[PDB]
């Protein structure tokens, strides 16, 4: 999806890449953190259903963790897209904007 | 994905199949409704960003729609897997639960 689309279509120049390296790594770490909650939650679901295959309080709670984590990933990705944009050379923002707006437009049709 | 796995995944008698096809339609409609809301949000993000490439009131509201949709999808998938289970004769439930448990545990790694 959208992070990967931008990184591929619109690659950073050598200075942008050095400059954005800490932010790219912090995003990676954030993404891994959210994904680790979503997997833990899959674990809690396997565990619960092994004990009682039913829509139990454990399964309700775990589902709510999966919900949160899914939404959090989308917010964290969107804020990162803007963060990246800000570190680009002003001359590079138009292509990046096009690629972004097109990706969102695609996602609307 | 989880859906795709289960699906494969246990034999169905004619009567189970009939009902599980009804349930598949119902799940299809729900997935479409959430997709619609996600698409509508994505358009709004695209519109706002083309106008002003910053985190505006419009971006915020659309991002919250996207978050809720991403979560709704994941809840819907999990509800459906129980709904499918509810279509199976009692005797055939243990085998389904084994595949589901396995799936969720692989999903936790
Ligand atoms: Cu990035
Ligand atoms: Cu299904």
UniProtKB/Swiss-Prot annotation, chains A, B:
Protein's name in the database: Nickel and cobalt resistance protein CnrR
Conditions for induction: By nickel and cobalt.
Residues included from the entire protein: 40 to 148 of 148
Function in brief: CnrH alone is able to activate cnr expression, while both CnrY and CrnR (CnrX) are needed for nickel induction of CnrH. Has been suggested to bind nickel.
Lineage top rank: taxon: Bacteria
Coiled-coil blocks: 15-78
Family from the record: To A.xylosoxydans NccX.
RNA-binding among keywords: no
Subcellular location, record wording: Periplasm
Species of the source: Cupriavidus metallidurans (strain ATCC 43123 / DSM 2839 / NBRC 102507 / CH34) (Ralstonia metallidurans)
Alphabetized UniProt keyword annotations: Cobalt, Coiled coil, Nickel, Periplasm, Plasmid, Signal
Sequence ranges on the Periplasmic membrane side: 1-109
Gene Ontology CC terms, in alphabetical order: periplasmic space
